[PDB]
Amino acid sequence: SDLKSPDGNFLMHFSLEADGTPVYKLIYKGKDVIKASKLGFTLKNDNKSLLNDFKIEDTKTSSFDENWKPVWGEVSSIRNNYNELAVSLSQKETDRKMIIRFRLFDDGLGFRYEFPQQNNLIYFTIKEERTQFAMAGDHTAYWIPGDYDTQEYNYSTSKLSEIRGLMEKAYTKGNASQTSFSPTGVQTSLMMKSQDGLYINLHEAALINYSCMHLNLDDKNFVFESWLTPDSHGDKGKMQAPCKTPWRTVIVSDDARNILASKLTYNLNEPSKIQETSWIKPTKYVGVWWEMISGKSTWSYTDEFPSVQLGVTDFSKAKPNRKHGATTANVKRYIDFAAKNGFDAVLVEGWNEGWEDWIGHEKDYVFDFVTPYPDFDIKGLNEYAHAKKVKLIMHHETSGAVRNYERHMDAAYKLMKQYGYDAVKSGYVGNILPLGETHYSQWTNNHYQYAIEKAADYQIMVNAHEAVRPTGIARTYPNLIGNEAARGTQYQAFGNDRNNANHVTILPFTRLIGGPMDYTPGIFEMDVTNGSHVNATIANQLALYVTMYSPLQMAADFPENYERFADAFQFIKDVAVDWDDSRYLEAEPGQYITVARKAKGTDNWFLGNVNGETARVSNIDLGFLEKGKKYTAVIYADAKDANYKTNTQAYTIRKVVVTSNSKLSQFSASGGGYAISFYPVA
Amino acid sequence: SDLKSPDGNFLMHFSLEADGTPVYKLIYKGKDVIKASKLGFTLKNDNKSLLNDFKIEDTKTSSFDENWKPVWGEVSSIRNNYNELAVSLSQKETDRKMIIRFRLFDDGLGFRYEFPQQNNLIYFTIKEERTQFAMAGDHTAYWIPGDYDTQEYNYSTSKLSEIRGLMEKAYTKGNASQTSFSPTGVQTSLMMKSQDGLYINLHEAALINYSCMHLNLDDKNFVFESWLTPDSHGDKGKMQAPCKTPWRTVIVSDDARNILASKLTYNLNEPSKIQETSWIKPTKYVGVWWEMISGKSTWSYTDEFPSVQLGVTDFSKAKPNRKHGATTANVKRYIDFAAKNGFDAVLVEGWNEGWEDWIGHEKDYVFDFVTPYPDFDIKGLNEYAHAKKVKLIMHHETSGAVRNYERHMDAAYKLMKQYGYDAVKSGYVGNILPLGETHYSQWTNNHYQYAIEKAADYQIMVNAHEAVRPTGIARTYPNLIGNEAARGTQYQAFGNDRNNANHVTILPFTRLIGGPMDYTPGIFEMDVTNGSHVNATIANQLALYVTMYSPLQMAADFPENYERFADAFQFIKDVAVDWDDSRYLEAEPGQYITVARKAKGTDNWFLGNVNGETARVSNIDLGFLEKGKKYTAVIYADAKDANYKTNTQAYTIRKVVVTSNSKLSQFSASGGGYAISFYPVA
């Protein structure tokens, strides 16, 4: 019946309605957070479905409290502490069995359904999940349109009752692959704030062998309902009992900072299944990349032909278009720059045959993932990098041809091992083939999961763009060091509205719940070749190495642009990519975030602040520093006249000595930020 | 404009209608065979398509005449001899380019379309092929319902005008996977006979990177029109220029025998791409097989569970159902029998975990193709077979889960090499996954092609059940040693109407055009465990080793049944499976076929006759024997009272000495036949 968090601040009441419908309710500090909300499923082709006519057959309670050491993360040790209530239901007429297991942490609630082995439910098809989250009122939400194919939108900040009105403007077009489902449909992770000051997050954890959950708002009664991603046949889960859904998560706090600090999502995922983890390596990198994204270079090698056919087109005899990014010469410039600046690795995109046809052609045999272009010396470059203690990050764009990638995967992973690539950036740009498939179906999520597991067997790290947004699986497979799976720094190069000034004050409350993002920060030249304008200050872009947590951190700009602001670049070079502790000092979604983190193995701290549309003075306590020690702090801040629109390169740098007793006050510009290194005094 | 066969008997006229529609016509010995028929395509999302407004830009004629040695076949040397006309078209308003290339052999016509590299047609989608074959009248046809998922039907013999009427009854239900498209749709290869004595076959050749062609009859004008197989999204070809369709084939003769003798289909496929072909091996085999098909055994190992989950179900601890066919003990019986009787191999089905769930569950992770059941000692059995100079044939049923098979394929092929399996029997039973895909789409055909190519790289032969019916590709990839892809001997065990008595007099005129069938002949006990009755006599079943040509010949029955009729079994033991010559002596589709073949490397001949509903005395010209030589003939015949319904086991055996000058005469029962070995006297 009743479940409480270990600290007593949460109560979850479970019951059945008069008609046997299962419902739950969640209360925080005596205030409704989830009102009476219904549970269960509509099945396809079924006499009854799983909405009602249950009775309670059994309940079991338990408790758990253990720590586990992540391979990489914000802390060196994570606490998994909950109470558990496991309700065994039996449906009348069908004798069908369905367990609903709840775990209630000090950060909030997670629940999921299990179907044990049974005689009258075996193979079955989910037509819709009917899992509800009834809100207590017309809350503020930070949201992006529900989509089966992209998450690449600007967030909207509005009341729940305003989402219908704002859907037309918020649903931005021009994407290679995007599909709407509802005038009131949004993605998770969904962030909200109530009128009475509660921060409420709705998400899921352990998305495996299942369809991605979106939410559909009933904007009359303020009920969000699970809405899963259809597959190529319109199905929302081919299930086989015994099976189990992913957890649904409600993360709550009266203090926005604790939302960011929460590990609930990881804690709901099963323990690492990789026994030996020292080959997984947090990575700071540059790449041949922004060149193409910002309109200076091509991924393609030749323009000679209407189309290309791998194994037929002789690229060694084709006319070079002279614009191609991934030349031996150019890849060497980025290696040189990485080695000189203490960076680990270098991404190269457009190294392989096929790029002439990579987008909008819905092509199956689009890449072989193994054959270099004639101007890219794979052997020499990997030798040259390795001699400079640098690695290349492999790039595997699939262009939606999942079968084609799967057939090539083994040989492509082997070619990585052969040359000493240990990490791959993968991509799923365009509609998934065959047409009618979606990016976030059960079918396609299986593929992303398969890529990761196989990667692991080869001791290869994965960072997967356009994949399903993460749900904590990195605990289980910590070689998933990244996803994009959200609107990244790249949209700052794509004109239109680029990224709103407060984007990076919302991502940590939404997309980062479930895992890190490859955000590709560190832009210093905001006015790029193709006319686009990045909406950030330099100090902003420095702070992202701390405020957008990731074991995979790019410095996305060109070496030349870093040489123009060497003094500011010092923070990017200094900052760590893995942490023993982390403290969120200030946070309010859509306005600002300020966080300090202790570099793993060290007594060094790195702090960042990111700030939204409204210029603001940030006031912090430096008592996270160790008592009795002096530290050199180097503050990289916005100039007073900086702004993300018309004065993006105005920064200051100053040195002052502080202790655990010190306070700090710092202006942040509109769309700006600050960054601090703290080194103990010698 | 005009094209002639090298012997003058065929004339094909090409032209444009006033509206620019391309059309062809075919004449044989002054008789219309193809009346004015239209060519081209309906494109998706294209106002104008490729139906008309062409003009002729160029024509090129040529000739070719060469022989080529197949690896395996009916003959030691095949003659490829045609005249070629290549018409280059250009569409007005679109500048689109389309070649139509015709080759005219002494056996008939093939043509296809090519799209060369061009500036205004790159990626495009075929909505329907618009290739016609206008008949001269209401011909007799031997046909099966048009289907995107099965060819496992009984043939119907009727007039073209009768097909609409007969469709309901001919479209038999109860198949795991079957989808109709038209009340007048039929499959190819389609056999016809005109009122005035022409044998007309309509088929295709080199079905690669393209959708399978069916025909839809307009039964008002007796025009058949290409009707391709939709994919999961309803498409009939995702094309990229430069590309090219398969050949469409019209094989004609005034003598039915020449239809069977024709190699036109092979001749239109490209030369072998396997350089070294001695590992490809015509194979006579038995197997643990019929036991399951005929209801005596299970593929499954246990009945203990509602469903199974690979990696989770512990089969070592499951309750054996003791019906399971593929035990070490039982597989040894068939090895012992193969070795003792000069057979090459032993198929085993149900050797691997998963079989509890193999049919109609639409299960993805249905098999791993590597993990033996706990009662099948893969190592001991392969050692034991090899030490008795026998091989096992691997069985890979996919149960429609193509992605699952593809992911497992490399390791499954490796496990074959590890234990000395060199041939695999594959299967595609149930709907293709994901749901909505078809068996004979471009997408799925790509999969069958991929299996074969990869098989070749491992030096593995492939025999694929429920795959697309063959179109001559074995020339190009002679490791494709068979397909089922029609109604096989198995339906003789499936009750209902089993196989019509004259089935095996139709298959050579239809399904065998394009490649051999694994028909699994050689039944001696016709009344099997589950009550079903095989509609053949014993002499019939001996004759199939010659009248259903295959480099892969099964003796389907149980060793016990062969040991009981050892005298008759002698033919199965003696007969060869590869040939240096073949002569079709008599043939009439749906009535009889009589053919004699010379065993490769030998002076031995083997003759078979199969006979339809009507009992018939056959008169055999033995002029194919070498002049002035004496031969021992052993005739295995129907007794005079034999009959496929009520007296299936009454056979005689006599020896007589013959020469090329002998003519001898033999009764064949209703659904019966005869078989003869010819050995030169010592």
Ligand SMILES: OC[C@H]1O[C@H](OC[C@H]2O[C@H](O[C@H]3[C@H](O)[C@@H](O)[C@H](O)O[C@@H]3CO)[C@H](O)[C@@H](O)[C@@H]2O)[C@H](O)[C@@H](O)[C@@H]1O
């Ligand atoms: O692997 C290469 C590249 O792939 C991903 O980025 C590709 C990105 O391309 C398109 O973006 C278009 C924008 O949506 C429009 O709004 C803009 O107008 O034009 C761009 C350029 O095509 C796709 O539509 C989009 O879905 C896709 O993500 C990786 O994220 C990137 O880092 C890679 O380098």
Ligand SMILES: OC[C@H]1O[C@H](OC[C@H]2O[C@H](O[C@H]3[C@H](O)[C@@H](O)[C@H](O)O[C@@H]3CO)[C@H](O)[C@@H](O)[C@@H]2O)[C@H](O)[C@@H](O)[C@@H]1O
């Ligand atoms: O690898 C297993 C087996 O697969 C193929 O044959 C399987 C065959 O199974 C079904 O046949 C059914 C018939 O449709 C019904 O008419 C009959 O009554 O019952 C049987 C079994 O339910 C599928 O429906 C059918 O499409 C499929 O081809 C191979 O051909 C065989 O050799 C293999 O051993």
Ligand SMILES: [Ca+2]
């Ligand atoms: Ca992207």
Ligand SMILES: [Ca+2]
């Ligand atoms: Ca079959």
Ligand SMILES: [Mg+2]
């Ligand atoms: Mg400037």
